[PDB]
Design a protein around this nucleic acid. Structure first.
Lengths: 131, 185, 57, 141
RNA sequence: ACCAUGGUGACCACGGGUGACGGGGAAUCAGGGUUCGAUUCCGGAGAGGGAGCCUGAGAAACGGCUACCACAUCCAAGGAAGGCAGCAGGCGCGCAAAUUACCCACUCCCGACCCGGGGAGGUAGUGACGAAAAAUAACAAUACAGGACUCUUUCGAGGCCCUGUAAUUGGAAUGAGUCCACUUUAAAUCCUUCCGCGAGGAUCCAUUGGAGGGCAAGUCUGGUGCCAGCAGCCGCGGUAAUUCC
């Protein structure tokens, strides 16, 4: 709010991916590492876009404070931003429900459907109620 | 199987024989003068000074108008000028062999921060590096054996976070102030 | 006598065991390279004795 | 005299390959029977149990009874001797233990003055032998 | 099948041994070499031991089948099931070697495929195999001792330099630890950024070896009496040991 500089360098757009990607460094005098929730709006008040397309990550801070630096990008459309995007960076600020069963149980269900062959209702209910 | 680097070599080497008095005590007056932590980082810099003279002995038996002498030699000579051990105009292949080990202990950060008077008492100039105070131009460094170059030799000063470069005092003022306004106003 | 197989541990188990009494902790590391460099090279004392060794009595 | 000429190297490489047998080190490391002779068989340490404390008198200019044990290994369990290189430490070792033995120091020959010893004692009963000599472990329950 | 009586050899065949997978390499280094390379890259071999096959573009496939050998499971005695020199773990051999942890997010692979699978692979935990950096107080003021600095002088200490005894303190010094918050990542932890804490016998306390020689360091005190022991070698020890404790 008082003394933070958000420079950019090495900006390249591509309408291939319909994104606008660049390198961002964050220079602060003596404060802490400012969060993404304070930085991903400081491009939104400068690129004039909605801050549901600006995705920032990768902030690694130098030895001695001052300049931390990282990578950021801007999709063209939130409709685009949910098509060509992996779900892990998409869900760092809340946009997707990702919690299935942990994979070690889902492995064992697939091999258990494999040992009860063919019967479609016992390829669904191969022990749903016995839990 | 892995994508690890695997490439890690040693940097110093042990001497040929141990316990001879014209080796360790002539090297004891270097461990104490330029104020180093132990003799492991003297065998480091003597092997650093060795491998340049390992390269420099090939470059003297290489003839003149040689491709790999003038290429490698100039590239060597433009690498130790910028490190400060060798001056500019008399850069040669011949003046590099008369070089001694003193001229690489001078070109550390630990005594180029002493002779700029940023601290006295050369063992203290180790500490105010390691104690997070003294910077290269925008980069504070707590490493005493930083080999400072010559372009960035003038910008050593206190860091802008430092007690001696900024403010926001530590506990030792704040605890001495607290006992006065803790039993009184 | 000739000590055939007995008195294994004859001289350790009868010599007096003195308590290792506590002292100042010794300065280590960079301080050890400080505190003995001053004792050997900068103080070349004008005393004689044909280079009397550092552990004299 | 020796056999030089620019076609001879069979003669040199066949005169060499037998004349390397006659020193000790190439014969003891490549014929293979000296790899069977040591009880370790390509090793440096091998455990064993203590049979009996039996003492040997040292060699000629000395006179003292050096103390030894009578280890029998678990791998290839042939009898050996072993010296306990310490002052009181025949009393720290006891009957029917398991110990570790190492070399006595100079490659299958005795050191000092013990006649016919080849092995030394480390770590009786998985606690260190010098750590019983200083007071850093005790023998278990 | 019919014929021919030939082939290989002291220029080492044939036979045997190999604690031999072959190589790119590693250590070593005046030059010549010497030794290892099971191992992450490529090429070969084998999935308990031999052997035989189906299907497939590709197999003499074993996370395909059947026979035998050897080991081994369930069983209501009728018959089934097998094969970790895949990843974690156990047992056993052993001087002797990682957690029955998380994820496909990253590098790639397969498919019908922007969508699914991946103990490949990455993230962790053990790790003093190792390699690379680097704490364990410096600063101080007497003070204790020396200084080419001092009077027209070995007048005497001192307007000035270094060191140890031994202090009293200190303050924009500081970490490891304690712990927020960001951050990193798949979600974490790391580590860096940052509040708050956090050092007077800085008690938050440096260990491994040695002190006759080779070989840097004690003829200091005591105990011992060829005993106990030390010592890689030469040696030391038998009432005053510079070697043992």
């Amino acid at each position: 709010n008082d003394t933070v500089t958000i420079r950019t360098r090495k900006f390249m757009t591509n309408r291939l991916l319909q994104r606008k990607q660049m390198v961002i460094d964050v220079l602060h005098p003596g404060k802490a590492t400012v969060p993404k929730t304070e930085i991903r709006e400081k491009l939104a008040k400068m690129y004039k876009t909605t801050p549901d397309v600006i995705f920032v990550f990768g902030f690694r801070t130098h030895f001695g404070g001052g300049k931390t630096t990282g990578f950021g990008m801007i999709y063209d459309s939130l409709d685009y931003a949910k098509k060509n995007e992996p779900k892990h960076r998409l869900a760092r600020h809340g946009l997707y429900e990702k919690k299935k069963t942990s994979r070690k149980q889902r492995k064992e269900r697939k091999n258990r459907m494999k040992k009860v062959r063919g019967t479609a209702k016992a390829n669904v209910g191969a022990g749903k109620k016995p839990k | 199987p892995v994508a690890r680097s695997w490439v890690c070599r040693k940097t110093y080497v042990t001497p040929r024989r141990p316990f001879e008095k014209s080796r360790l005590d002539q090297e004891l007056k270097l461990i104490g003068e330029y104020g180093l932590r132990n003799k492991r980082e003297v065998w480091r810099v003597k092997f650093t000074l060795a491998k340049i003279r390992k390269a420099a002995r090939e470059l003297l038996t290489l003839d003149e108008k040689d491709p790999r002498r003038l290429f490698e030699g100039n590239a060597l000579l433009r690498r130790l000028v910028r490190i400060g051990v060798l001056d500019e105009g008399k850069m040669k292949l011949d003046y590099i062999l008369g070089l001694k080990i003193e001229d690489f202990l001078e070109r550390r950060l630990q005594t180029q921060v002493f002779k700029l008077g940023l601290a006295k008492s050369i063992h203290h100039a180790r500490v105010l590096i390691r104690q997070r105070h003294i910077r290269v131009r925008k980069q504070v460094v707590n490493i005493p054996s930083f080999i400072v170059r010559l372009d960035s030799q003038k910008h050593i000063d206190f860091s802008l976070r430092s007690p001696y470069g900024g403010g926001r005092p530590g506990r030792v003022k704040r605890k001495n102030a607290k006992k006065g306004q803790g039993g009184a106003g | 006598v000739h000590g055939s197989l007995a008195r294994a541990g004859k001289v350790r188990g009868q010599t007096p065991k003195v308590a290792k009494q506590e002292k100042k902790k010794k300065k280590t590391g960079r301080a050890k390279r400080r505190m003995q460099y001053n004792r050997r090279f900068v103080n070349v004392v004008p005393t004689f004795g044909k280079k009397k060794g550092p552990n004299a009595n | 005299g020796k056999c030089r000429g620019l076609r001879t190297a069979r003669k040199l490489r066949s005169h060499r390959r037998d004349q390397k047998w006659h020193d000790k080190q190439y014969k003891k490391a490549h014929l293979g029977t000296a790899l069977k002779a040591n009880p370790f068989g390509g090793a440096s340490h091998a455990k064993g149990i203590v049979l009996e404390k039996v003492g040997v008198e040292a060699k000629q200019p000395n006179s003292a009874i050096r103390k030894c044990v009578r280890v029998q290994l678990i791998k290839n369990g042939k009898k050996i001797t072993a010296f306990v290189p310490n002052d009181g430490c025949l009393n720290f070792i006891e009957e029917n233990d398991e110990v570790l033995v190492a070399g006595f120091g100079r490659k299958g020959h005795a050191v000092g003055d013990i006649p016919g010893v080849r092995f030394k004692v480390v770590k009786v009963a998985n606690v260190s032998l010098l750590a019983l000599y200083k007071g850093k472990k005790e023998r278990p329950r």
